Design a protein around this ligand. Sequence first.
Ligand SMILES: *CCC(=O)N1CC2(CCN(c3nc4c(c(-c5cc(O)cc6ccccc56)c3F)C[C@H]3C[C@@H]4C3(C)C)C2)C1
Ligand SMILES: Nc1nc2c(ncn2[C@@H]2O[C@H](COP(=O)(O)OP(=O)(O)O)[C@@H](O)[C@H]2O)c(=O)[nH]1
Ligand SMILES: [Mg+2]
Length: 168
Amino acid sequence: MTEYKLVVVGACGVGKSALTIQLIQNHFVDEYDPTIEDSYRKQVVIDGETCLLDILDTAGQEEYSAMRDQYMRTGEGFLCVFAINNTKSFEDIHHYREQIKRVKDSEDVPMVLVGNKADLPSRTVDTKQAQDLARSYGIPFIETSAKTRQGVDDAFYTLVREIRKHKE
Ligand SMILES: *CCC(=O)N1CC2(CCN(c3nc4c(c(-c5cc(O)cc6ccccc56)c3F)C[C@H]3C[C@@H]4C3(C)C)C2)C1
Ligand SMILES: Nc1nc2c(ncn2[C@@H]2O[C@H](COP(=O)(O)OP(=O)(O)O)[C@@H](O)[C@H]2O)c(=O)[nH]1
Ligand SMILES: [Mg+2]
């Protein structure tokens, strides 16, 4: 079967681990150690294709390193996650997109913008502002809740479809 290597990136606390564990293990984690960086795998069917999702949930220190560049470079697509109630996490996205372009040495890398925690009140990032950003990047934007499951499959499956488009 076809393997898709996905990498989940974004600020501490946006829900990278919760999104990954909801997709792979079908449950919402109320807490997940922010030092646990690992890959999680699941066989799924997307548009009739049986495939293996190989998802790297990034964690540890906010730092640049050749060591990290080496394994991040293996990613075929990037899920760029911010939390809709954390303006700083939205502002951070630019730094992730720029480093993805650097490590992949390309202006054309499969990417999806994800606004997580859609279930929470008191949002600080307007959906239309995130939609405008995604339009400016030429990538899809999906609002998700790792808690309720809203948009979770759509976010990961859309990234798989972006990877297929790049492979042509
Ligand atoms: C609370 C812990 C947690 O969940 N964290 C996510 C993070 C670990 C990794 N992550 C991170 N932050 C940034 C950058 C990268 C990054 C670094 C590389 O060397 C290579 C690549 C390649 C693609 C995407 C991202 C990277 C990173 F993994 C780069 C800039 C954005 C910040 C940055 C300012 C260092 C944070 C802690
Ligand atoms: N209400 C709500 N809480 C969430 C959601 N996603 C993550 N969380 C919570 O936010 C915190 C940070 O999530 P985590 O997955 O550890 O974020 P990470 O640091 O990006 O891996 C945890 O307490 C999660 O339970 C969500 O969609 N909705
Ligand atoms: Mg985590």
